[PDB]
Protein backbone atom coordinates (compact mmCIF):
# COMPACT_ATOMS: atom_id res chain seq x y z
CA UNK A 1 0.00 0.00 0.00
CA UNK A 2 1.10 3.59 -0.69
CA UNK A 3 0.62 6.69 1.45
CA UNK A 4 0.57 10.26 0.15
CA UNK A 5 3.22 12.74 1.25
CA UNK A 6 4.03 16.43 0.83
CA UNK A 7 7.18 18.34 1.74
CA UNK A 8 7.84 21.91 2.82
CA UNK A 9 10.05 24.45 1.01
CA UNK A 10 11.98 25.12 4.23
CA UNK A 11 12.86 21.44 4.55
CA UNK A 12 11.63 21.26 8.15
CA UNK A 13 8.20 19.66 7.72
CA UNK A 14 6.37 16.80 6.00
CA UNK A 15 2.70 15.77 5.97
CA UNK A 16 1.43 12.23 5.34
CA UNK A 17 -2.10 11.20 4.36
CA UNK A 18 -3.54 7.77 3.68
CA UNK A 19 -5.81 8.97 0.87
CA UNK A 20 -7.10 12.15 -0.75
CA UNK A 21 -10.52 10.64 -1.58
CA UNK A 22 -12.48 10.10 1.67
CA UNK A 23 -15.58 8.03 0.92
CA UNK A 24 -18.73 9.46 2.51
CA UNK A 25 -20.97 6.67 3.75
CA UNK A 26 -24.56 7.51 4.63
CA UNK A 27 -24.07 7.39 8.42
CA UNK A 28 -20.33 7.91 9.05
CA UNK A 29 -17.63 9.71 7.07
CA UNK A 30 -14.10 8.37 6.88
CA UNK A 31 -11.62 9.96 9.32
CA UNK A 32 -8.70 12.08 8.15
CA UNK A 33 -5.58 10.52 9.65
CA UNK A 34 -1.85 11.08 9.26
CA UNK A 35 1.37 12.11 10.95
CA UNK A 36 3.47 15.27 10.63
CA UNK A 37 7.23 14.72 10.44
CA UNK A 38 9.03 17.77 11.80
CA UNK A 39 12.59 18.91 12.48
CA UNK A 40 13.55 18.88 16.19
CA UNK A 41 15.65 22.03 15.68
CA UNK A 42 12.65 24.34 15.35
CA UNK A 43 10.58 21.90 17.43
CA UNK A 44 12.70 22.97 20.42
CA UNK A 45 10.88 26.31 20.34
CA UNK A 46 7.29 25.12 19.92
CA UNK A 47 5.37 22.03 18.82
CA UNK A 48 3.49 21.66 15.53
CA UNK A 49 -0.02 22.86 14.72
CA UNK A 50 -2.18 21.04 12.17
CA UNK A 51 -5.19 22.63 10.49
CA UNK A 52 -8.07 21.09 8.55
CA UNK A 53 -10.11 23.68 6.67
CA UNK A 54 -13.08 23.47 4.31
CA UNK A 55 -13.67 26.47 2.07
CA UNK A 56 -16.20 27.46 -0.58
CA UNK A 57 -15.12 29.98 -3.22
CA UNK A 58 -17.36 31.99 -5.55
CA UNK A 59 -17.19 35.29 -7.42
CA UNK A 60 -13.66 36.09 -8.55
CA UNK A 61 -10.61 36.77 -0.68
CA UNK A 62 -14.32 36.02 -1.16
CA UNK A 63 -14.56 32.74 0.75
CA UNK A 64 -16.63 31.20 3.52
CA UNK A 65 -14.84 28.46 5.40
CA UNK A 66 -14.79 26.26 8.49
CA UNK A 67 -11.41 25.90 10.19
CA UNK A 68 -10.93 22.95 12.54
CA UNK A 69 -7.79 23.52 14.59
CA UNK A 70 -5.59 20.91 16.29
CA UNK A 71 -2.30 21.49 18.12
CA UNK A 72 0.08 18.55 18.49
CA UNK A 73 -7.71 6.63 19.27
CA UNK A 74 -4.76 5.52 17.14
CA UNK A 75 -6.06 3.83 14.00
CA UNK A 76 -4.12 1.15 12.15
CA UNK A 77 -2.85 3.65 9.58
CA UNK A 78 -1.65 5.99 12.34
CA UNK A 79 0.09 3.10 14.10
CA UNK A 80 1.77 1.99 10.87
CA UNK A 81 2.90 5.52 10.03
CA UNK A 82 4.37 6.12 13.48
CA UNK A 83 6.02 2.68 13.47
CA UNK A 84 7.73 3.48 10.17
CA UNK A 85 8.71 7.08 10.95
CA UNK A 86 9.67 7.15 14.62
CA UNK A 87 9.76 9.59 17.52
CA UNK A 88 8.91 12.94 15.92
CA UNK A 89 5.93 11.68 13.86
CA UNK A 90 3.40 13.42 16.07
CA UNK A 91 -0.01 12.09 15.00
CA UNK A 92 -3.18 14.00 14.21
CA UNK A 93 -6.72 13.05 13.25
CA UNK A 94 -9.88 14.97 12.34
CA UNK A 95 -13.44 13.64 12.36
CA UNK A 96 -15.69 14.93 9.58
CA UNK A 97 -19.30 15.26 10.66
CA UNK A 98 -21.60 13.92 7.91
CA UNK A 99 -23.48 17.18 7.32
CA UNK A 100 -20.43 18.72 5.63
CA UNK A 101 -20.72 18.90 1.82
CA UNK A 102 -18.65 17.12 -0.81
CA UNK A 103 -16.11 18.38 -3.35
CA UNK A 104 -17.70 20.06 -6.39
CA UNK A 105 -16.15 22.70 -8.67
CA UNK A 106 -17.92 24.83 -11.26
CA UNK A 107 -17.01 25.29 -14.92
CA UNK A 108 -14.53 28.18 -15.26
CA UNK A 109 -15.47 30.88 -17.73
CA UNK A 110 -13.10 31.43 -20.65
CA UNK A 111 -12.85 35.14 -19.76
CA UNK A 112 -11.34 34.39 -16.33
CA UNK A 113 -8.43 32.33 -14.98
CA UNK A 114 -8.99 31.06 -11.45
CA UNK A 115 -7.90 27.97 -9.56
CA UNK A 116 -11.49 26.77 -8.92
CA UNK A 117 -14.91 27.94 -7.72
CA UNK A 118 -16.29 25.47 -5.21
CA UNK A 119 -15.78 23.38 -2.11
CA UNK A 120 -12.25 22.25 -1.25
CA UNK A 121 -10.66 20.34 1.62
CA UNK A 122 -7.20 21.23 2.90
CA UNK A 123 -4.66 19.88 5.41
CA UNK A 124 -1.96 22.17 6.79
CA UNK A 125 0.97 22.00 9.21
CA UNK A 126 3.41 24.65 10.43
CA UNK A 127 5.61 25.67 13.36
CA UNK A 128 5.31 28.97 15.23
CA UNK A 129 6.10 30.17 18.75
CA UNK A 130 2.69 31.88 18.93
CA UNK A 131 -0.67 31.40 17.23
CA UNK A 132 -0.48 34.89 15.68
CA UNK A 133 3.13 34.83 14.41
CA UNK A 134 2.16 33.67 10.90
CA UNK A 135 4.95 35.49 9.06
CA UNK A 136 6.56 32.90 6.76
CA UNK A 137 4.48 30.82 4.37
CA UNK A 138 7.77 29.09 3.51
CA UNK A 139 7.46 27.10 6.76
CA UNK A 140 4.05 25.57 5.96
CA UNK A 141 2.61 22.71 3.90
CA UNK A 142 -0.69 22.83 2.01
CA UNK A 143 -2.25 19.56 0.82
CA UNK A 144 -5.70 19.28 -0.79
CA UNK A 145 -8.07 16.33 -0.36
CA UNK A 146 -11.62 15.49 -1.43
CA UNK A 147 -14.76 13.89 -0.03
CA UNK A 148 -16.83 11.85 -2.49
CA UNK A 149 -19.93 9.65 -2.61
CA UNK A 150 -21.03 6.65 -4.66
CA UNK A 151 -24.35 5.35 -5.94
CA UNK A 152 -26.49 3.21 -3.61
CA UNK A 153 -26.84 -0.48 -4.41
CA UNK A 154 -30.68 -0.48 -4.16
CA UNK A 155 -32.29 1.23 -7.17
CA UNK A 156 -35.79 2.60 -6.94
CA UNK A 157 -38.79 1.80 -9.12
CA UNK A 158 -38.91 2.54 -12.85
CA UNK A 159 -39.26 6.35 -13.09
CA UNK A 160 -42.50 7.03 -14.93
CA UNK A 161 -44.74 10.05 -15.41
CA UNK A 162 -47.63 10.99 -17.67
CA UNK A 163 -49.91 13.91 -18.47
CA UNK A 164 -53.35 13.81 -20.08
CA UNK A 165 -54.32 17.30 -21.26
CA UNK A 166 -56.94 18.45 -23.75
CA UNK A 167 -55.24 20.98 -26.02
CA UNK A 168 -57.44 24.10 -26.16
CA UNK A 169 -60.65 22.89 -27.79
CA UNK A 170 -60.40 19.10 -27.67
CA UNK A 171 -62.46 15.98 -27.07
CA UNK A 172 -60.29 13.77 -24.87
CA UNK A 173 -56.82 14.48 -23.45
CA UNK A 174 -53.59 13.52 -25.17
CA UNK A 175 -51.78 10.79 -23.25
CA UNK A 176 -47.98 11.05 -23.16
CA UNK A 177 -46.25 8.34 -21.13
CA UNK A 178 -42.47 8.46 -20.74
CA UNK A 179 -40.63 5.71 -18.86
CA UNK A 180 -36.91 5.55 -18.21
CA UNK A 181 -35.41 2.08 -17.98
CA UNK A 182 -33.99 2.59 -14.44
CA UNK A 183 -33.40 5.24 -11.80
CA UNK A 184 -29.65 4.78 -11.23
CA UNK A 185 -27.86 5.72 -14.45
CA UNK A 186 -24.08 5.76 -14.40
CA UNK A 187 -22.19 8.71 -15.85
CA UNK A 188 -22.52 8.75 -19.62
CA UNK A 189 -24.81 5.73 -19.88
CA UNK A 190 -27.71 6.15 -22.34
CA UNK A 191 -31.10 7.25 -21.00
CA UNK A 192 -33.49 5.07 -23.02
CA UNK A 193 -36.62 7.18 -22.62
CA UNK A 194 -39.42 4.86 -23.77
CA UNK A 195 -42.02 7.22 -25.25
CA UNK A 196 -45.63 6.26 -25.96
CA UNK A 197 -48.26 8.73 -27.15
CA UNK A 198 -51.82 8.38 -28.43
CA UNK A 199 -54.26 11.10 -29.38
CA UNK A 200 -57.78 11.97 -30.46
CA UNK A 201 -57.38 15.76 -30.45
CA UNK A 202 -57.24 17.48 -33.82
CA UNK A 203 -53.76 18.72 -32.88
CA UNK A 204 -50.60 16.79 -33.74
CA UNK A 205 -46.98 16.81 -32.64
CA UNK A 206 -44.69 18.47 -35.18
CA UNK A 207 -41.42 18.13 -33.25
CA UNK A 208 -40.35 16.16 -30.17
CA UNK A 209 -37.71 17.80 -27.97
CA UNK A 210 -35.89 15.50 -25.55
CA UNK A 211 -33.20 16.90 -23.26
CA UNK A 212 -31.35 16.28 -20.01
CA UNK A 213 -31.50 19.25 -17.64
CA UNK A 214 -28.93 19.47 -14.85
CA UNK A 215 -30.26 21.08 -11.67
CA UNK A 216 -27.89 22.64 -9.15
CA UNK A 217 -28.37 25.05 -6.26
CA UNK A 218 -26.09 27.18 -4.10
CA UNK A 219 -27.40 26.86 -0.55
CA UNK A 220 -25.14 29.68 0.67
CA UNK A 221 -26.61 32.16 -1.81
CA UNK A 222 -30.23 33.26 -1.69
CA UNK A 223 -32.43 32.30 -4.66
CA UNK A 224 -29.57 30.42 -6.33
CA UNK A 225 -31.05 27.54 -8.34
CA UNK A 226 -29.30 27.05 -11.69
CA UNK A 227 -30.44 24.75 -14.49
CA UNK A 228 -28.75 24.48 -17.89
CA UNK A 229 -29.62 22.21 -20.84
CA UNK A 230 -27.44 19.17 -21.51
CA UNK A 231 -27.56 16.81 -24.51
CA UNK A 232 -30.61 18.51 -26.01
CA UNK A 233 -32.15 16.41 -28.79
CA UNK A 234 -34.83 17.58 -31.23
CA UNK A 235 -36.34 14.83 -33.37
CA UNK A 236 -38.90 15.54 -36.08
CA UNK A 237 -41.14 12.50 -35.52
CA UNK A 238 -44.83 13.28 -35.95
CA UNK A 239 -48.03 11.59 -34.67
CA UNK A 240 -51.21 12.84 -36.42
CA UNK A 241 -54.58 12.70 -34.51
CA UNK A 242 -55.86 9.12 -33.88
CA UNK A 243 -52.47 7.36 -34.05
CA UNK A 244 -50.10 5.55 -31.69
CA UNK A 245 -46.35 6.04 -31.32
CA UNK A 246 -43.57 4.09 -29.62
CA UNK A 247 -39.82 4.70 -29.73
CA UNK A 248 -36.69 4.23 -27.63
CA UNK A 249 -34.45 7.30 -27.80
CA UNK A 250 -30.89 6.89 -26.49
CA UNK A 251 -29.98 10.28 -25.06
CA UNK A 252 -26.66 10.83 -23.36
CA UNK A 253 -25.44 13.79 -21.28
CA UNK A 254 -21.88 14.76 -22.15
CA UNK A 255 -19.33 17.55 -21.78
CA UNK A 256 -18.11 18.33 -25.31
CA UNK A 257 -21.03 20.46 -26.48
CA UNK A 258 -21.55 21.96 -23.00
CA UNK A 259 -17.97 23.01 -22.23
CA UNK A 260 -18.78 26.62 -23.20
CA UNK A 261 -21.54 26.75 -20.57
CA UNK A 262 -21.15 28.83 -17.41
CA UNK A 263 -21.62 27.28 -13.99
CA UNK A 264 -21.74 23.67 -15.19
CA UNK A 265 -20.84 21.79 -12.02
CA UNK A 266 -18.10 19.18 -12.42
CA UNK A 267 -16.45 16.73 -10.06
CA UNK A 268 -13.92 18.22 -7.66
CA UNK A 269 -10.55 19.09 -9.17
CA UNK A 270 -7.31 18.84 -7.22
CA UNK A 271 -5.05 20.57 -9.76
CA UNK A 272 -6.18 22.67 -12.71
CA UNK A 273 -7.39 19.46 -14.36
CA UNK A 274 -10.58 18.45 -16.20
CA UNK A 275 -13.28 16.19 -14.77
CA UNK A 276 -16.64 14.74 -15.73
CA UNK A 277 -20.07 16.15 -14.97
CA UNK A 278 -20.97 16.49 -11.31
CA UNK A 279 -22.50 13.51 -9.53
CA UNK A 280 -25.71 13.69 -7.53
CA UNK A 281 -25.73 14.28 -3.77
CA UNK A 282 -26.80 11.60 -1.28
CA UNK A 283 -28.16 11.99 2.24
CA UNK A 284 -30.09 9.61 4.48
CA UNK A 285 -31.39 11.96 7.18
CA UNK A 286 -33.82 14.85 7.05
CA UNK A 287 -30.80 17.13 7.22
CA UNK A 288 -31.18 20.89 7.34
CA UNK A 289 -29.40 22.34 4.32
CA UNK A 290 -25.84 23.04 5.45
CA UNK A 291 -24.46 26.52 4.83
CA UNK A 292 -21.52 25.37 2.66
CA UNK A 293 -21.83 23.12 -0.44
CA UNK A 294 -23.44 22.62 -3.90
CA UNK A 295 -26.29 20.10 -4.34
CA UNK A 296 -26.50 18.60 -7.84
CA UNK A 297 -29.45 16.72 -9.35
CA UNK A 298 -30.36 15.53 -12.85
CA UNK A 299 -33.74 15.34 -14.57
CA UNK A 300 -34.79 14.34 -18.09
CA UNK A 301 -37.30 16.61 -19.83
CA UNK A 302 -39.48 15.29 -22.66
CA UNK A 303 -41.45 17.91 -24.58
CA UNK A 304 -44.12 17.88 -27.28
CA UNK A 305 -45.06 20.79 -29.54
CA UNK A 306 -48.15 21.21 -31.73
CA UNK A 307 -49.62 23.80 -34.08
CA UNK A 308 -49.62 24.93 -27.60
CA UNK A 309 -47.09 22.77 -25.77
CA UNK A 310 -47.03 19.99 -23.17
CA UNK A 311 -44.17 18.24 -21.38
CA UNK A 312 -43.41 16.01 -18.41
CA UNK A 313 -40.23 15.74 -16.36
CA UNK A 314 -38.65 12.55 -15.03
CA UNK A 315 -35.95 12.44 -12.31
CA UNK A 316 -33.13 9.92 -12.22
CA UNK A 317 -29.92 9.22 -10.32
CA UNK A 318 -26.57 9.95 -12.00
CA UNK A 319 -23.63 8.63 -9.99
CA UNK A 320 -20.52 6.52 -10.31
CA UNK A 321 -20.84 2.89 -9.20
CA UNK A 322 -19.24 1.83 -5.95
CA UNK A 323 -15.69 0.53 -6.68
CA UNK B 1 9.47 30.51 -2.00
CA UNK B 2 7.12 28.40 -4.13
CA UNK B 3 5.23 25.28 -2.98
CA UNK B 4 6.50 21.66 -3.19
CA UNK B 5 4.85 18.84 -5.22
CA UNK B 6 2.63 16.29 -3.39
CA UNK B 7 4.49 12.94 -3.58
CA UNK B 8 3.90 9.49 -2.04
CA UNK B 9 5.64 6.99 0.23
CA UNK B 10 5.69 3.32 1.18
CA UNK B 11 4.43 1.59 4.31
CA UNK B 12 4.35 -2.11 5.14
CA UNK B 13 1.45 -4.31 4.05
CA UNK B 14 0.96 -5.75 7.55
Amino acid at each position, epitope marked *: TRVFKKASPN*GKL*TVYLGKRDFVDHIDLVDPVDGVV*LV*DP*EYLKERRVYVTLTVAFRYGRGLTFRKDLFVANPLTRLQERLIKKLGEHAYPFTFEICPNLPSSVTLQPGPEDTGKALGVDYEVKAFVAENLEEKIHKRNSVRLVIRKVQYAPERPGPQPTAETTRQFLMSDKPLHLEASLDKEIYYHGEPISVNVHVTNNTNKTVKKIKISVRQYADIVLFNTAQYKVPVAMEEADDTVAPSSTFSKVYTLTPFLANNREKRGLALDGKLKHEDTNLASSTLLREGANREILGIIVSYKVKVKLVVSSDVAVELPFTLMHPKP | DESCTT*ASSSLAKD
Partner: nanobody, 111 residues
Protein backbone atom coordinates in the same frame (compact mmCIF):
# COMPACT_ATOMS: atom_id res chain seq x y z
CA UNK C 1 17.78 16.92 -6.54
CA UNK C 2 20.48 15.21 -4.46
CA UNK C 3 23.34 12.83 -5.18
CA UNK C 4 25.30 10.46 -2.96
CA UNK C 5 28.78 8.93 -2.98
CA UNK C 6 30.53 5.98 -1.39
CA UNK C 7 29.00 2.54 -1.36
CA UNK C 8 30.45 -0.79 -2.36
CA UNK C 9 31.45 -4.21 -1.10
CA UNK C 10 32.95 -4.35 2.39
CA UNK C 11 34.20 -7.15 4.64
CA UNK C 12 33.62 -7.50 8.37
CA UNK C 13 36.31 -5.95 10.55
CA UNK C 14 36.87 -2.83 8.43
CA UNK C 15 35.14 0.51 7.98
CA UNK C 16 33.39 2.47 5.26
CA UNK C 17 32.84 6.21 4.81
CA UNK C 18 29.77 7.59 3.06
CA UNK C 19 28.78 11.10 2.00
CA UNK C 20 26.15 13.03 0.07
CA UNK C 21 25.77 16.25 -1.92
CA UNK C 22 22.60 18.33 -1.68
CA UNK C 23 21.48 21.01 -4.13
CA UNK C 24 18.92 23.73 -3.52
CA UNK C 25 18.28 25.48 -0.21
CA UNK C 26 17.62 22.38 1.92
CA UNK C 27 20.96 22.17 3.77
CA UNK C 28 22.10 25.31 5.57
CA UNK C 29 19.78 25.60 8.59
CA UNK C 30 18.13 22.18 8.22
CA UNK C 31 19.22 18.97 9.92
CA UNK C 32 20.39 16.31 7.47
CA UNK C 33 19.59 12.64 7.98
CA UNK C 34 20.50 9.32 6.43
CA UNK C 35 18.42 6.20 5.83
CA UNK C 36 18.92 2.50 5.11
CA UNK C 37 16.56 0.10 3.33
CA UNK C 38 16.43 -3.62 4.00
CA UNK C 39 15.82 -5.82 0.92
CA UNK C 40 12.07 -5.78 0.31
CA UNK C 41 11.28 -3.80 3.47
CA UNK C 42 10.76 -0.12 4.22
CA UNK C 43 13.64 2.22 5.00
CA UNK C 44 15.23 2.48 8.44
CA UNK C 45 16.50 5.77 9.84
CA UNK C 46 20.19 5.81 10.74
CA UNK C 47 21.56 9.04 12.19
CA UNK C 48 21.43 12.84 12.00
CA UNK C 49 23.34 16.11 12.06
CA UNK C 50 21.58 19.24 13.32
CA UNK C 51 22.04 22.88 12.35
CA UNK C 52 24.39 23.52 15.27
CA UNK C 53 26.58 20.56 14.32
CA UNK C 54 25.69 18.27 17.23
CA UNK C 55 24.16 14.86 16.67
CA UNK C 56 21.00 13.07 17.77
CA UNK C 57 20.37 9.43 16.89
CA UNK C 58 17.14 7.60 16.15
CA UNK C 59 19.21 4.43 15.72
CA UNK C 60 18.44 1.43 17.91
CA UNK C 61 22.16 0.59 17.90
CA UNK C 62 23.79 4.00 18.47
CA UNK C 63 27.29 2.54 18.37
CA UNK C 64 30.39 3.50 16.37
CA UNK C 65 28.82 5.94 13.89
CA UNK C 66 30.29 9.37 13.12
CA UNK C 67 28.28 12.13 11.43
CA UNK C 68 29.97 15.20 9.95
CA UNK C 69 27.89 18.08 8.58
CA UNK C 70 29.39 20.73 6.29
CA UNK C 71 27.66 24.11 6.19
CA UNK C 72 29.94 25.40 3.42
CA UNK C 73 30.77 22.72 0.82
CA UNK C 74 27.19 21.38 0.46
CA UNK C 75 27.88 17.90 1.79
CA UNK C 76 27.05 15.60 4.70
CA UNK C 77 29.25 12.76 5.98
CA UNK C 78 28.20 9.49 7.62
CA UNK C 79 30.72 6.93 8.84
CA UNK C 80 30.44 3.19 9.46
CA UNK C 81 32.88 1.39 11.73
CA UNK C 82 31.01 -1.42 13.54
CA UNK C 83 30.14 -3.61 10.58
CA UNK C 84 27.53 -6.30 11.22
CA UNK C 85 25.66 -8.52 8.74
CA UNK C 86 22.52 -6.48 9.43
CA UNK C 87 24.32 -3.55 7.78
CA UNK C 88 23.90 -5.40 4.46
CA UNK C 89 21.41 -3.01 2.87
CA UNK C 90 21.04 -0.07 0.49
CA UNK C 91 21.78 3.25 2.19
CA UNK C 92 20.11 6.51 1.18
CA UNK C 93 20.29 10.16 2.20
CA UNK C 94 17.64 12.83 2.69
CA UNK C 95 16.37 15.36 5.20
CA UNK C 96 14.93 14.23 8.52
CA UNK C 97 11.60 15.34 7.04
CA UNK C 98 12.66 13.68 3.76
CA UNK C 99 11.77 16.88 1.91
CA UNK C 100 14.04 16.56 -1.11
CA UNK C 101 13.14 14.31 -4.04
CA UNK C 102 13.95 10.82 -2.77
CA UNK C 103 16.41 9.70 -5.42
CA UNK C 104 18.87 6.89 -6.02
CA UNK C 105 20.84 5.65 -3.03
CA UNK C 106 24.06 3.74 -2.43
CA UNK C 107 24.59 0.06 -1.66
CA UNK C 108 26.78 -1.53 1.02
CA UNK C 109 27.25 -5.30 1.27
CA UNK C 110 29.15 -7.29 3.91
CA UNK C 111 29.88 -11.02 4.18
Amino acid sequence: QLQESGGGLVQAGGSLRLSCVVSGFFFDTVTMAWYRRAPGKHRELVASATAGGTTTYADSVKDRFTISRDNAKNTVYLQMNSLKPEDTAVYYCNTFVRSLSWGQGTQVTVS
